[PDB]
Amino acid sequence: GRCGLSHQCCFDISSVLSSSQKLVELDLSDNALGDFGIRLLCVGLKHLLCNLQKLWLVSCCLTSACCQDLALVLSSNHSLTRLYIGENALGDSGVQVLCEKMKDPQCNLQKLGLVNSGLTSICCSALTSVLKTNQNFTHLYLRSNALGDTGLRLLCEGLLHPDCKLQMLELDNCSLTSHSCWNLSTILTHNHSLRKLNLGNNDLGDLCVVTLCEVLKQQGCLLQSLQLGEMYLNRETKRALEALQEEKPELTIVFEISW
Amino acid sequence: DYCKMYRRHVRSRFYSIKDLNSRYTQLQLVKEHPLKLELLFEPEDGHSEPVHTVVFQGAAGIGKTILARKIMLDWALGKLFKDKFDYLFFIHCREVSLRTPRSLADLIVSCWPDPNPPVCKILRKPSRILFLMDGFDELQGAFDEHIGEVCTDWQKAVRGDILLSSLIRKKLLPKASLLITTRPVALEKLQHLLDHPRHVEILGFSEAKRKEYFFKYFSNELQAREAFRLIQENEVLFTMCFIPLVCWIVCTGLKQQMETGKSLAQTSKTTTAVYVFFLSSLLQSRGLFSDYLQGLCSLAADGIWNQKILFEECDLRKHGLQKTDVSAFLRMNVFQKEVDCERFYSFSHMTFQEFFAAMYYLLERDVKVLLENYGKFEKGYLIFVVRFLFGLVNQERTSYLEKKLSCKISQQVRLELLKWIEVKAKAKKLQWQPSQLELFYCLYEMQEEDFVQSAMDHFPKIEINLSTRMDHVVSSFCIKNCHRVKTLSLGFFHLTSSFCRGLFSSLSTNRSLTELDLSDNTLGDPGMRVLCEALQHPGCNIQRLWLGRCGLSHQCCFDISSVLSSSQKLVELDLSDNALGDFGIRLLCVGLKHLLCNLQKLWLVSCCLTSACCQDLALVLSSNHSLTRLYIGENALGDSGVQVLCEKMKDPQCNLQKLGLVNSGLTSICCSALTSVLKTNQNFTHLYLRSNALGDTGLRLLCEGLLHPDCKLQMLELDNCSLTSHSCWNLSTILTHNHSLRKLNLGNNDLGDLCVVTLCEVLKQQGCLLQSLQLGEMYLNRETKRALEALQEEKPELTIVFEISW
């Protein structure tokens, strides 16, 4: 991670990923594995039978032009189930590939960190497809992404598929109308989809957290936690939020903004 | 060259309008953003570097076009006007409202063409052209004022659509200043449209210069004083005397009454009431006219219904009831045709037009589409329409009008309004939709007890912001008729003694149930004095009083002490961000202890006090037992109160659950006092040390305080410190020895990788804490993250660690 590294390692590590029967995770972080070395990586992964568990391509300066190969190796292998691609240089136009990674069950990809993407609508539509179809898809770490209200709306529409087991989820950056959060809370009430959630730099307004605290107040939607940061909202929101946890510890915590 | 002949044309246009030169009193221009028309357009680099435009606002119906005309004529005459500009063009959009694609339109009377190309040539170097466009509210069409699809040429000689040429000229490459006049109903179309503008509010008649206007309008002796003072003696009509349209309509409406005599202040309650009285006074000797009024009525409203505000010299009227009655109407309404100056007929300020629209539904369509279309931009905001509708639907006025006009009126509309009220009760988008203030206007204007009660039942909480005394009165009226309203938040935007006294004598009638907030509002010297006399009477009063960030000072202290003595309903009282410096904390504490009060919370957060009052806080805390939640949040105290801090809770049965703390000074002694309280005091659930210069020895002796078993201390926090990564180990081990707390936070604590490594090991083996733990802002290496992300899924006992960034 962050090591002085380049494309050359790719074939090498592919070779050892083939010949290794002991490695269970391998991290490639902040290292200039630009592209086509991701191809060498994926061919090394799929060609033999390897007991790989994690695979981190975080901040590796790749593009969508290798995501198809990532999907191929993900379909072929089943040992790999934890695939961070964290906020590298991809986004839209990989969206069809993003979906067809998990277009069927038995993919076995528990967590899937995501990227600073581009056009929200199509990628979040692929996310809805994976959420409604794929089993054991425990996390979806969309973070610092230009995702819109329509995007997250169709995301909760993806949550509308019941029996979809999706644990901890996150929507970091967005600008929504304060009914969308109401839809997600109500859909959690309808079915205990996830456990916690984060809202980061989301400009949501007082009424947003007001609806949030009411819906959690009456048989709370989520059951574990919720994290809110960096708002300058008025303080009767704080009074309502500080009230509700002591009567109901179901919402174990809301991350207090500053006070 | 061209300037002179048209500056005389505009002088001729605006001199004759009434005169109005010696008939004017200055109104108020205000820009708070928390005036002087001279040099209104400073582009100075304080906060207005690139700006080019201002929007005029104010109370409903100022005659605003009149003020535009006054500015126009003032420049035309000069009057010490340093000419920053070569032309100010008055656009009467009430006429430009047509759909016709028109080019630059500097001709109005269709005179010989202006030097339009050389006018375009005197553009590039001097930006001394300006267009005072007015009546933006009357841009008709299909309520389509979104972003322009197609731009226009800079020469402006192209006869493009004003939607596609003029609007984009405003939007991009304007090259000239801009001033637009309209009401705040539904303008955001043009403001989400990027302009980088300012806004200024216009305020009508204050008492003194309203008297000046009365003197200037009336003759100096015939009616200048006695009428003024007799309408002064009215408890109302001084609420509306602020509004200029009311003053202009009572000044013109009372010169017909000396022929009758002593009929001035009668039947004068509300805007609808005075409009009805004025219309009846004008139409007194007319009854014949029963059909003429209906014919004019059944056509006036279509000006905004079909959205053809212009009558085309009243050719639609030529179809509908054109007789000598039209000549009589024009003669008594001189400002109908003369404003157009060539052929055309219209109304004065469309307010009598909306009154006639209310008359329409009074006489005999469907109410469904109107209430659906409420406040839109197709039938014309419907604001004054529904205002007069509510004013009329009052049952006494219903009977009076059904007898006067020989007309049947439906009572279903009353229910429709009801339905509407529940709908706007359930409308969560109240920021970009009509507020609660005009609903209050309407319910006041319709004066029905049970109806106002039912309307208020749908609203458990009120959010308004007072600007007019009319706002104060309508708020008082509605609030004194509430039973299903819990919280009453009020926005004061400035005497106020009696206003708020009424506002909360309404709460004295709200004894059914109430809750109060007054935050981020500057209660003056008697602003403190309000709500004290209100809380000083028994009954059912506010359970929880809020005064946070309010303009407040030492004076309130004694006052609130008094009400804290005389109140048996308050359970919490907040004093936040308010300059209750010191010795007012003494007044607070003496008020608390002297009597028996059921106080629960007490927030002195960010009140600029010192340790010199903490002893008094401890005395009152020892005396009282009801108080158990005492925030002193990070105000200006610290060490040297430490002995007091301890001796607050030196014994049990103190009953102080939570105790927020302060940015303190010398750690050791204060945290020693904290150890004393932790080891001795029962039911001490929180200890919110935050943003404090607390040292490793400090927190070490704190965990030594935790060493006392059977000490019930819930959620705890240590925000800022620099510790060795064994101290955290001690706290975790002592939690393992005894389940002291539930969660903890570590904030800006620079702790090192080994710290969280020890943390995750000790929680890994039968975790110390049992609920949560919060960590923020570390740049630590990532195998710490792997260990922490691992442990929760195998053991959810530590339900969460706040992830730093990933």
Swiss-Prot record, chain A:
Phosphoserine PTM positions: 29, 258
Location(s) in or outside the cell: Cytoplasm, Cytosol; Inflammasome; Cytoplasm, Cytoskeleton, Microtubule organizing center; Golgi apparatus membrane
Induction or repression: By activators of Toll-like receptors, such as lipoteichoic acid (LTA) (TLR2), polyinosine-polycytidylic acid (poly(I:C), a synthetic analog of dsRNA) (TLR3) and bacterial lipopolysaccharides (LPS) (TLR4). Up-regulated by IL2 via STAT5 signaling. Slightly up-regulated in osteoblasts after exposure to invasive, but not invasion-defective, strains of Salmonella typhimurium (at protein level).
Keywords: Activator, ATP-binding, Cytoplasm, Cytoskeleton, Disulfide bond, Endoplasmic reticulum, Golgi apparatus, Hydrolase, Immunity, Inflammasome, Inflammatory response, Innate immunity, Isopeptide bond, Leucine-rich repeat, Lipoprotein, Membrane, Mitochondrion, Nucleotide-binding, Nucleus, Palmitate, Phosphoprotein, Repeat, Secreted, Transcription, Transcription regulation, Ubl conjugation
Chain ranges for the short sequence motif KFERQ-like motif 4 as given in the UniProt record: 214-218
Crosslinked positions (Glycyl lysine isopeptide (Lys-Gly) (interchain with G-Cter in ubiquitin)): 101, 196
Effect of residue 56 to A: In LRRm1 mutant; abolished ability to form homooligomeric double-ring cages that hide pyrin domains to avoid premature activation
Tissue-by-tissue expression: Expressed with high levels in peripheral blood leukocytes, including Th2 lymphocytes and macrophages. Expressed at low levels in resting osteoblasts (at protein level).
Intervals of motif KFERQ-like motif 3: 21-25
Residue ranges of coiled coil: none
Post-translational modification: Phosphorylation at Ser-29 by CSNK1A1 prevents inflammasome activation by preventing NEK7 recruitment. Ubiquitinated; undergoes both 'Lys-48'- and 'Lys-63'-linked polyubiquitination. Ubiquitination does not lead to degradation, but inhibits inflammasome activation. Deubiquitination is catalyzed by BRCC3 and associated with NLRP3 activation and inflammasome assembly. This process can be induced by the activation of Toll-like receptors (by LPS), through a non-transcriptional pathway dependent on the mitochondrial production of reactive oxygen species, and by ATP. Ubiquitinated by TRIM31 via 'Lys-48'-linked ubiquitination, leading to its degradation by the proteasome.
GO CC annotation, single: nucleus
Single GO MF descriptor: DNA-binding transcription factor binding
GO BP field: acute inflammatory response; cellular response to lipopolysaccharide; cellular response to peptidoglycan; defense response to Gram-positive bacterium; defense response to virus; detection of biotic stimulus; inflammatory response; innate immune response
Lipid-linked residues (S-palmitoyl cysteine): 60-61, 67, 181
Keyword Iron-sulfur part of the UniProt annotation: no
UniProt comment concerning the protein's domains: The pyrin domain (also called DAPIN domain or PYD) is involved in PYCARD/ASC-binding. The FISNA domain is a critical mediator of NLRP3 conformational during NLRP3 activation. It becomes ordered in its key regions during activation to stabilize the active NACHT conformation and mediate most interactions in the NLRP3 disk.
UniProt subunit comment: Sensor component of NLRP3 inflammasomes; inflammasomes are supramolecular complexes that assemble in the cytosol in response to pathogens and other damage-associated signals and play critical roles in innate immunity and inflammation. The core of NLRP3 inflammasomes consists of a signal sensor component (NLRP3), an adapter (PYCARD/ASC), which recruits an effector pro-inflammatory caspase (CASP1 and, possibly, CASP4 and CASP5). Homodecamer; inactive NLRP3 forms homodecameric double-ring cages that hide pyrin domains within NACHT-LRR rings to avoid premature activation.
Similarity comment text for this entry: Belongs to the NLRP family.
Purpose of the protein: Sensor component of the NLRP3 inflammasome, which mediates inflammasome activation in response to defects in membrane integrity, leading to secretion of inflammatory cytokines IL1B and IL18 and pyroptosis. In response to pathogens and other damage-associated signals that affect the integrity of membranes, initiates the formation of the inflammasome polymeric complex composed of NLRP3, CASP1 and PYCARD/ASC.
Protein name from the UniProt record: NACHT, LRR and PYD domains-containing protein 3
Organism: Mus musculus
